[PDB]
Scaffold this active site. Structure first.
Site, PDB file in Angstrom:
ATOM      1  N   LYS D 164       9.349  -1.758   1.694  1.00 52.24           N
ATOM      2  CA  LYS D 164       9.038  -1.706   0.272  1.00 52.24           C
ATOM      3  C   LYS D 164       8.917  -3.074  -0.382  1.00 52.24           C
ATOM      4  O   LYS D 164       8.261  -3.185  -1.420  1.00 52.24           O
ATOM      5  CB  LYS D 164      10.074  -0.856  -0.470  1.00 52.24           C
ATOM      6  CG  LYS D 164      11.490  -1.321  -0.352  1.00 52.24           C
ATOM      7  CD  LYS D 164      12.424  -0.366  -1.037  1.00 52.24           C
ATOM      8  CE  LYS D 164      13.843  -0.834  -0.886  1.00 52.24           C
ATOM      9  NZ  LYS D 164      14.280  -0.733   0.519  1.00 52.24           N
ATOM     10  N   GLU D 190      17.811  -8.426  -4.961  1.00 52.57           N
ATOM     11  CA  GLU D 190      17.147  -8.682  -3.694  1.00 52.57           C
ATOM     12  C   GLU D 190      17.615 -10.029  -3.142  1.00 52.57           C
ATOM     13  O   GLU D 190      18.551 -10.646  -3.656  1.00 52.57           O
ATOM     14  CB  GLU D 190      15.633  -8.646  -3.863  1.00 52.57           C
ATOM     15  CG  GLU D 190      15.135  -9.670  -4.861  1.00 52.57           C
ATOM     16  CD  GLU D 190      13.640  -9.865  -4.826  1.00 52.57           C
ATOM     17  OE1 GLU D 190      12.976  -9.252  -3.969  1.00 52.57           O
ATOM     18  OE2 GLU D 190      13.128 -10.645  -5.651  1.00 52.57           O
ATOM     19  N   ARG D 191      16.958 -10.506  -2.090  1.00 56.40           N
ATOM     20  CA  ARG D 191      17.324 -11.771  -1.476  1.00 56.40           C
ATOM     21  C   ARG D 191      16.878 -12.942  -2.342  1.00 56.40           C
ATOM     22  O   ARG D 191      15.868 -12.876  -3.044  1.00 56.40           O
ATOM     23  CB  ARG D 191      16.692 -11.869  -0.093  1.00 56.40           C
ATOM     24  CG  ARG D 191      17.172 -10.805   0.856  1.00 56.40           C
ATOM     25  CD  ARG D 191      16.430 -10.862   2.161  1.00 56.40           C
ATOM     26  NE  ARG D 191      16.883  -9.820   3.068  1.00 56.40           N
ATOM     27  CZ  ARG D 191      16.375  -8.597   3.100  1.00 56.40           C
ATOM     28  NH1 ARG D 191      15.405  -8.263   2.271  1.00 56.40           N
ATOM     29  NH2 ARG D 191      16.840  -7.705   3.956  1.00 56.40           N
TER      30      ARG D 191
HETATM   31  N1  LIG Z   1       2.632  -3.436   6.490  1.00 53.96           N
HETATM   32  C1  LIG Z   1       3.457  -3.852   7.477  1.00 53.96           C
HETATM   33  N2  LIG Z   1       2.978  -4.255   8.669  1.00 53.96           N
HETATM   34  C2  LIG Z   1       3.795  -4.661   9.653  1.00 53.96           C
HETATM   35  N3  LIG Z   1       5.131  -4.700   9.545  1.00 53.96           N
HETATM   36  C3  LIG Z   1       5.742  -4.320   8.404  1.00 53.96           C
HETATM   37  C4  LIG Z   1       4.917  -3.863   7.283  1.00 53.96           C
HETATM   38  N4  LIG Z   1       5.758  -3.543   6.291  1.00 53.96           N
HETATM   39  C5  LIG Z   1       7.014  -3.779   6.734  1.00 53.96           C
HETATM   40  N5  LIG Z   1       7.006  -4.237   7.994  1.00 53.96           N
HETATM   41  C6  LIG Z   1       8.202  -4.599   8.785  1.00 53.96           C
HETATM   42  O1  LIG Z   1       9.343  -3.963   8.211  1.00 53.96           O
HETATM   43  C7  LIG Z   1      10.241  -4.907   7.628  1.00 53.96           C
HETATM   44  C8  LIG Z   1      10.543  -4.495   6.193  1.00 53.96           C
HETATM   45  O2  LIG Z   1      10.822  -5.673   5.458  1.00 53.96           O
HETATM   46  P1  LIG Z   1      10.988  -5.664   3.868  1.00 53.96           P
HETATM   47  O3  LIG Z   1       9.947  -4.768   3.280  1.00 53.96           O
HETATM   48  O4  LIG Z   1      11.006  -7.100   3.426  1.00 53.96           O
HETATM   49  O5  LIG Z   1      12.474  -5.090   3.639  1.00 53.96           O
HETATM   50  P2  LIG Z   1      12.859  -3.833   2.713  1.00 53.96           P
HETATM   51  O6  LIG Z   1      11.958  -2.721   3.164  1.00 53.96           O
HETATM   52  O7  LIG Z   1      14.312  -3.580   3.011  1.00 53.96           O
HETATM   53  O8  LIG Z   1      12.619  -4.358   1.323  1.00 53.96           O
HETATM   54  C9  LIG Z   1       9.552  -6.255   7.690  1.00 53.96           C
HETATM   55  O9  LIG Z   1      10.435  -7.225   8.238  1.00 53.96           O
HETATM   56  C10 LIG Z   1       8.394  -6.088   8.634  1.00 53.96           C
HETATM   57  O10 LIG Z   1       8.756  -6.649   9.892  1.00 53.96           O
HETATM   58 MG   LIG Z   2      13.661  -5.652  -0.013  1.00 53.71          MG
END
Ligand SMILES: Nc1ncnc2c1ncn2[C@@H]1O[C@H](COP(=O)(O)OP(=O)(O)O)[C@@H](O)[C@H]1O
Ligand SMILES: [Mg+2]
Ligand SMILES: Nc1ncnc2c1ncn2[C@@H]1O[C@H](COP(=O)(O)OP(=O)(O)OP(=O)(O)O)[C@@H](O)[C@H]1O
Ligand SMILES: [Mg+2]
Lengths: 71, 175, 51, 471, 494, 469, 71
Positions: D164, D190-191
């Site tokens: 997200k 968040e971070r």
């Molecule tokens: N569209 C995408 N394509 C490839 N990998 C993804 C994508 N979206 C998320 N990811 C993977 O899933 C992880 C989710 O990270 P992030 O969205 O920053 O954390 P959160 O979902 O907890 O906010 C990422 O580190 C990435 O490696």
């Molecule tokens: Mg996040």
């Protein structure tokens, strides 16, 4: 376990008026305000579940009638 | 949890004693009530007894706690009606703390190996009155002969030590 | 081995210090405090002035 | 001339006692500024906000910074107003903390600037605007199945590490340059490194100087994180009220608002609510979320990431915020472990704009037939799990054979995900994703392999990827 | 003995000390209440009569809530609690390197006192948004599967998550041992471990010379929950001394789930109402103000970093639990360790699907990128084709170019214990793997091939190693194919 | 003066009030000896463990026996120490309660005997042993496939007719024979008739003269059952510290320790932690199982039975014990009905010590080949069931023909089973069982019949048993 | 069978202490014959009712509850 009605402004007027108890039948003073709750010392003749207005014009419903305050 | 409620009740009685301009009489008969209830501890157990009705206990207070002033007697009867007669010595101690805060009298306890002379007590009061900010100050003296050649004075919760722990300090520093 | 030696030295020192303090206290107890009481009062006054 | 003493310090929560008849109102700001008289003291610059009244002239406050160093008896200055936050054209291109102070090291905002109070009541009934029109995002699941609304609330539900923040960055990359109006980013819990990265890509992509940023990251004590989103929101609602501007608002983890309320609620003297949450878990979030509205003067299209604790959608803080949102995309860990990115649950994600009168008729029939084949495949999961593909009655085999292709053509390569995989990423218009899913539903691409549909923008790229695979 | 005593007796001067005392009301379960202490501040260290330290959490109207930092059996009602004037200081300095200390900074290994000068507070704010910089420097662990698949850069937080007996502590000790050549200062924070295992950890660090630069901060399973609660905060407080001087610090937290359990204990004894899995509401804020205090500073702050490797122990591999998902949403990735792969012999048992690195990829050394992308796709293809294509025959491409290379990927990515590999040898062996040079060496001999190939590189192919060590790029591909095909003639297939 | 008044009695929890400054420290013992002064009273001998300081000079204690008959105002002795329990050679061959008093009718321990406090801090980081060395038992399945550790915690998984008491008893005999140590059985919260049966088994097997028993059983209050492992462990610590030898410390049903702690926490009024457990579950388990360590003086290695409630290995009471364990010896009913004694399941039994850096390369390779051979035999069980013993292949027939010889060579003759079978029993050192299993794996003993391998010690003994048959 | 059987009864309408003290009366009647050399069988019909009744007594005496509010 301190009671809600033990406030040094309220205890003062009960030690002063101890011999002649005055009645707070229709007026009331606030003890606590928070999150849509008000404890009110006084209001001796309120009904349970009554419309109650504050000094602003905001209405309130007196749900709890404890021994020395009104919820 | 009793000292905060005693501070509450004592602050109410203190505001009454200041608005009536009769602080010395309220201080005197609060000292009398504290001495009378510290003399005999069975009176609270008598007033906690269930077969005595509330009016009989009020009659016991009105007959026994007579000669004290009218706000003191009304405070005692208000404590009896609220089932808070157990905190009357706590009320007395908190009220005398407020009275000594008003007059500027501070309480200090000095531990000295010799009994201190009155000129030394007046000198210590004149020294520490500027230190704690109060106008005047009182010293209570207990010998405690385990102390060797010095004074160990305590104002409230702060200890001014110069009697023995110089030697304890230096043997903690050598080791 | 070196650490053990240092520890032993520290232990001996601690024992010596403990022995010395008790003896010092006894000596103080033996010594007259009439002169000392006046001095302590002066010291207290000095401390108050400092603080 | 009327100041107060500190009575109690219990974590983030401070009790202040004032004189009789001079105590503040609820939500007013209280300043502690102490000078550290001797060695046993620490310099303090705290802001406290009033939360309750306790009686005996005492006041139950919540600290906005750390209370390490507070002494009982310390003197508290009343300000007579809530936390006032500077606003105007001077907040565009600047980064702010929770007190409205700039933290981007580019200067200090002058004292004669305009400062709106944080705590105001929500917009009324007669002021709101209820127009519904599609915000085009370039994402196939979002355009097909849960169309976002230009001016409505948008929620990105997901677990931990499911996508997200990548999805909020992809929506910034697809919308924020094209928007032509003010953006506001509120970072709630968040971070802190994700606030550094995002600031520098705003600087690199030029979206700054039409962007106002506010960070209240997870290092902050919870009294800050309860008020960060309100600072970003009063910055946005200045623009949409006093200027009538179109405003994008982005909040990453508005869950952290309610979690920061839960961290303070026990110390405020409240009984535990459902699970470990406050009793006020719905009205504290309703008094925030219902200020994020589109009115007759301007619109705020707010896209909000919403954390879901322990992957439990039935938890009260994710459950009570479904009723606030117009369009949602529910992210799944089960889809993220399948390599399907964005891991949007195609069934559980809804919108107020998937209606035939808004997206059109053809869009609506393609979307509902996609959802029907995915629902039939979800129903067949158990028979496939135990008995396999062998016993399905030759139309259920076709349902599975098309639904694998549909489930993988929902996944897409992002511009933001180029740093993850090296693949450059795509922007799919709405007509082309409807045409691509219609051609998948018609049977035109049954002959291609199913791994040829993963992480691919349009359907000609499915064709060329299957060509490079060797079909 | 007698000289320094006479010198210090000739050097002393008289003084009067203030005390600022309070008296104990209650003692129970490691938490006290105390009257007095009128001018105590929140978070201040207090000292009991027997020398045990305490932490003032709650300042209430007449009493102070004190959390006892140590053995609470000697503290009784009526004891005398005095102030110190300081907010949660641990001793920090260069002199703490090579020592094993408790979370209060007192030496536990028994090698004398720790003679430091400066102290840092335990709960200090994190670096700001503008005080940071993007992670671009490699933190080389020496584990091939980490440094290839899930790379770690200096300044990020990499969760290392897995069940019990999966090799988390081994990964920690390998990546601490590998920092001998680098300018990295390691810190190993052991929270709730068996103290015999911490004893063997300290001994296997001193065997590999690792105690010349690392600090071990131990708070064992028998210690009370307040010392278990302040171990990681003492770890960052000892790391930030070097972080804000410009140095680069690695900090490993062994079992933060045993920190969360102890904070749950310490808050349920304070009678705070708990949430999911009976954890308190600020169990997120516990780990969040910890790990967000581990950053990569900018050039104005000094450029130093603090890379953190926290651990979370799962129960039956459930990554969707409460404390695992709290730590995943703080950290910059995870290294998920299988128990199926650990008991099938794949050690390190890194699940390459569930493990990811976010700022990694921008951390690799411009050779490992080109060499390891094909490795990652080959390993994903192998572990997603082995579970389905176990029985029955299939086409020739999926029978050879997926499975017979993926078994070689698995045999390459295994390591022995306490033997970290330099990154140039990792680059060359994954080059030989991915460019199709292990397709004729059988599966049972790939590890012996690697062990002999490193000895071959140390003698003949030294120019390739120095080229990757200086340039960081791959050498000329024909020049490297010559060396690998020249070693293959020397290798004996057996 | 340390004479106190009883203020509150409510179940197993007693509140006692002393004077100011004379309060007893936490975990001290408080005796109540009250002889009845009239017919309206009851004679009382009752001890109390201090648990909290409540304020107002009041102390909340937990009780070690029944509190019936207590009067508010009955006077309490402060002992000035925790529950001091007798230690030394006077404890070997005796049965004890949690107070260090003999349940046996042999006699009382005198007042001049040394008594060590039940609550001790764990040994420091500087006192522990740096190297992991193997506790050699002489039981081949133990010291070949799940090797023990001096200072290790080991989980017995089984019970109810699989040979747990026989395994325990043979461990006592072998350790006290070869290593010279003693043993301590701490029966925590386990029923009285099984303690009686275990007492008479060790009485008529001669094992009891080299062990000390501590029974704190179900009929006792939860504060009495919680402190049982501590008062057996402080008997094991005398022989670890003063004598400097390697001691066994048996805790039957370590889950009863955790649930008795949960009951004491529920009586003390604490807010419950995850599930139904005390908040201090990991801290109480750490204060128990960090004194079971190996120092430079000696060691304490503990063999412990774990209940694992609800068949759930992720329940917090199994999950916090498993963070301290080093080996598991799964006892199986199927191996006991097959005629294999001890009934240690070879594949389910794992150990942290079975590693080449601890035991060696040869032991590791032989043990892993034994485990692979038995695993492939268990896989070929279904093929033999649906296809027959023959016509599988040559290699499958050979691996069955070696694996059945292996799984019958695992059983031994015990010294404790000499009173039932007549054969003397054997201590098999670990080099000889490594050599024997290597020779069985290399095919040196394929020609001998497989019923000679059953219930015999060494490999020379199966040579003589095959030539005698 | 009533030449050698004693019957102890505590119905649902009886107070919760009699439900709590029924089995202890059962073993108090049994131990008198056990310590004379006789053999006794004691049958506890639904001890779960005793567990519920002692839960009731401990909660009305406001002793702190545990799992399923049993003491
Ligand atoms: N569209 C995408 N394509 C490839 N990998 C993804 C994508 N979206 C998320 N990811 C993977 O899933 C992880 C989710 O990270 P992030 O969205 O920053 O954390 P959160 O979902 O907890 O906010 C990422 O580190 C990435 O490696
Ligand atoms: Mg996040
Ligand atoms: N790469 C490896 N190669 C060989 N053996 C390994 C490797 N990694 C770990 N091991 C073995 O696994 C055993 C346990 O691993 P480790 O203790 O690191 O796991 P853990 O999760 O930390 O266990 P715990 O949580 O109980 O402390 C060690 O004894 C070690 O010998
Ligand atoms: Mg570990």
């Amino acid at each position: 376990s301190i009671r809600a009605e033990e406030i040094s402004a309220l205890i003062k007027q009960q030690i002063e008026n101890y011999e002649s108890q005055i009645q707070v039948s229709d007026v009331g003073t606030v003890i606590q305000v928070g999150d849509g709750i008000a404890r009110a010392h006084g209001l001796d003749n309120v009904m349970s579940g009554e419309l109650v207005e504050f000094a602003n014009g905001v209405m309130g419903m007196a749900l709890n009638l404890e021994e020395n305050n009104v919820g | 949890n009793q000292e905060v409620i005693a501070k509450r009740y004592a602050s109410a009685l203190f505001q009454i004693a200041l608005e009536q301009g009769q602080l010395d009489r309220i201080e005197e008969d609060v000292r009398a009530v504290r001495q009378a209830l510290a003399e005999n501890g069975e009176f609270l157990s008598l007033l906690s007894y269930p077969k005595l009705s509330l009016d009989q206990k009020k009659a016991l207070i009105a007959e026994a706690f007579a000669g004290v002033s009218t706000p003191v007697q009304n405070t005692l009867l208000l404590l009896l009606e609220r089932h808070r007669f157990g905190l009357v010595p706590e009320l007395a101690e908190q009220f005398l703390a407020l009275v000594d805060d008003a007059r500027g009298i501070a309480k200090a306890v000095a531990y000295s190996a010799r009994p201190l002379t009155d000129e030394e007590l007046r000198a210590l009061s004149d020294v520490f009155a500027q230190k704690v900010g109060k106008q005047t100050l009182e010293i209570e003296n207990i010998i405690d002969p385990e102390l060797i050649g010095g004074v160990r004075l305590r104002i409230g919760n702060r200890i001014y030590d110069g009697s023995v722990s110089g030697q304890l300090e230096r043997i903690r520093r050598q080791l | 081995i070196e650490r053990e030696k240092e520890q032993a030295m520290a232990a001996l020192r601690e024992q010596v210090a403990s022995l010395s303090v008790l003896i010092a206290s006894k000596v103080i107890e033996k010594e007259l405090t009439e002169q000392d009481q006046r001095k302590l009062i002066e010291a207290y006054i000095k401390d108050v002035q400092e603080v | 001339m009327t100041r107060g003493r500190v009575i109690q310090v219990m974590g983030p929560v401070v009790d202040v006692k004032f004189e009789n008849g001079h105590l503040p109102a609820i939500y007013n700001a209280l300043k502690i500024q102490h000078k550290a008289r001797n060695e046993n003291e620490v310099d303090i610059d705290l802001t406290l906000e009033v939360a309750l009244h306790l009686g005996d002239d005492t006041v139950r406050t919540i600290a906005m910074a750390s209370t390490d160093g507070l002494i009982r008896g310390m003197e508290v200055i009343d300000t007579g107003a809530p936390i006032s936050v500077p606003v105007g054209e001077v907040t565009l291109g600047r980064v702010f903390n929770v007190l409205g102070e700039p933290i981007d090291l580019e200067g200090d905002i002058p004292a004669d600037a305009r400062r709106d109070p944080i705590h105001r009541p929500a917009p009324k009934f007669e002021e709101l605007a209820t127009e519904v029109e599609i915000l085009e995002t370039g994402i196939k699941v979002v355009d097909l199945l849960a169309p976002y609304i230009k001016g409505g609330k948008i929620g990105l539900f997901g677990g931990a590490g499911v996508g997200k923040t990548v999805l909020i960055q992809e929506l910034i990359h697809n919308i924020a340059q094209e928007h032509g109006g003010i953006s506001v980013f509120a970072g709630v819990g968040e971070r802190t490194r994700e606030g550094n990265d995002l600031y520098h890509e705003m600087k690199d992509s030029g979206v700054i100087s039409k962007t106002a940023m506010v960070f209240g990251q997870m290092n902050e004590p919870p009294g800050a994180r309860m008020r960060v989103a309100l600072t970003g929101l009063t910055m946005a609602e200045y623009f949409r009220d006093e200027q009538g501007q179109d405003v994008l608002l982005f909040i990453d983890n508005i869950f952290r608002f309610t979690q920061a309320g839960s961290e303070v609620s026990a110390l405020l003297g409240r009984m535990p609510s459902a699970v470990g949450y406050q009793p006020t878990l719905a009205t504290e979030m309703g008094q925030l979320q219902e200020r994020i509205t589109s009115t007759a003067k301007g619109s705020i299209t707010s896209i909000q990431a919403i954390y879901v604790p322990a992957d439990d959608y039935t938890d009260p803080a994710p459950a009570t915020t479904f009723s606030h949102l117009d369009a949602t995309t529910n992210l799944e860990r089960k889809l993220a472990e399948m390599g399907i990115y964005p891991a949007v649950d195609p069934l559980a994600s809804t919108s107020r704009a998937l209606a035939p009168e808004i997206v059109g008729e053809e869009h609506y029939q393609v979307a509902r037939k996609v959802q029907q084949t995915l629902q039939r495949y979800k129903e067949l999961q158990d028979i496939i799990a135990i008995l396999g593909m062998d016993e399905l009655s030759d139309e259920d085999k076709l349902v599975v054979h098309r639904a694998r292709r549909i489930q993988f053509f929902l996944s897409q390569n992002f511009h933001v995900a180029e740093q993850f995989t090296g693949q450059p990423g795509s922007y799919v218009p709405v007509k082309e994703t409807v045409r691509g899913f219609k051609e998948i539903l018609e049977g035109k691409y049954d002959h291609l392999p199913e791994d040829a549909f993963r992480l691919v923008g349009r359907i000609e790229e499915v064709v060329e990827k299957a060509k490079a695979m060797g079909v | 003995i007698s000289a320094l005593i006479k010198q210090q007796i000739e050097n002393y001067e008289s003084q009067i000390q203030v005390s600022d005392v309070g008296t104990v009301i209650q003692v129970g379960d490691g938490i006290a209440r105390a009257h007095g202490l009128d001018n105590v501040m929140s978070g201040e260290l207090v000292e009991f009569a027997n020398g045990v330290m305490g932490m003032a959490l709650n300042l209430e109207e007449n009493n102070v809530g004190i959390v006892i930092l140590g053995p609470y059996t000697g503290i009784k009602e009526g004891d005398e609690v005095r102030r110190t004037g300081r907010i949660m200081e641990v001793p920090v300095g260069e002199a703490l390197i090579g020592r094993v200390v408790n979370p209060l900074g007192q030496p536990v290994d028994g090698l004398g006192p720790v003679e430091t000068t400066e102290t840092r507070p335990i709960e200090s704010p994190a670096p700001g948004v503008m005080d940071r910089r993007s992670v671009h420097e490699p933190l080389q662990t020496g584990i091939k599967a980490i440094d290839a698949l899930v790379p770690i850069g200096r300044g990020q937080r990499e969760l290392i998550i897995g069940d019990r007996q999966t090799g988390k502590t081994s990964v920690a000790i390998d990546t601490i041992i590998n920092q001998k050549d680098q300018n990295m200062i390691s810190i190993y924070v052991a929270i709730g471990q068996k103290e015999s295992t911490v004893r063997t950890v300290v001994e296997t660090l001193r065997k590999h010379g690792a105690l010349d630069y690392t600090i071990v901060v131990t708070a064992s399973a028998s210690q009370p929950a307040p010392l278990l609660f302040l171990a990681p905060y003492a770890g960052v407080a000892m790391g930030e001394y070097f972080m804000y001087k410009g140095k680069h610090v690695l900090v490993v937290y062994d079992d933060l789930s045993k920190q969360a359990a102890a904070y749950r204990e310490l808050s349920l004894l304070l009678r705070r109402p708990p949430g999911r899995e009976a954890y308190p509401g600020d169990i997120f804020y516990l780990h969040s103000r910890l790990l967000e205090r581990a950053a990569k500073l900018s050039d104005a702050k000094g450029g130093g970093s603090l890379t953190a490797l926290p651990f979370v122990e799962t129960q039956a591999g459930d990554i969707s639990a409460y404390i695992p998902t709290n730590v995943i949403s703080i950290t910059d990735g995870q290294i998920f360790l299988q128990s199926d792969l650990f008991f099938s012999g794949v050690r390190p048992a890194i699940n390459a699907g569930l493990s990811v690195s976010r700022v990694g990829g921008a951390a690799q050394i411009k050779a490992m990128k080109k060499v390891a992308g094909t490795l990652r796709l080959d390993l994903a293809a192998y572990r997603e084709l082995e579970a389905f294509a176990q029985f029955g025959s299939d086409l020739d491409k999926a029978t050879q170019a997926k499975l017979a290379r993926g078994a070689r990927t698995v045999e390459v990515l295994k390591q022995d214990l306490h033997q970290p590999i330099p990154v140039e040898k990792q680059v060359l062996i994954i080059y030989a793997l991915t460019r199709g040079f292990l397709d004729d060496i059988p599966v049972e001999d790939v590890r012996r091939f690697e062990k002999e190939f490193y000895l071959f590189l140390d003698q003949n192919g030294q120019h390739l190693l120095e080229h990757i060590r200086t340039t960081k790029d791959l050498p000329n591909e024909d020049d490297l194919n010559k060396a690998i095909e020249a070693f293959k003639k020397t290798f004996v297939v057996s």
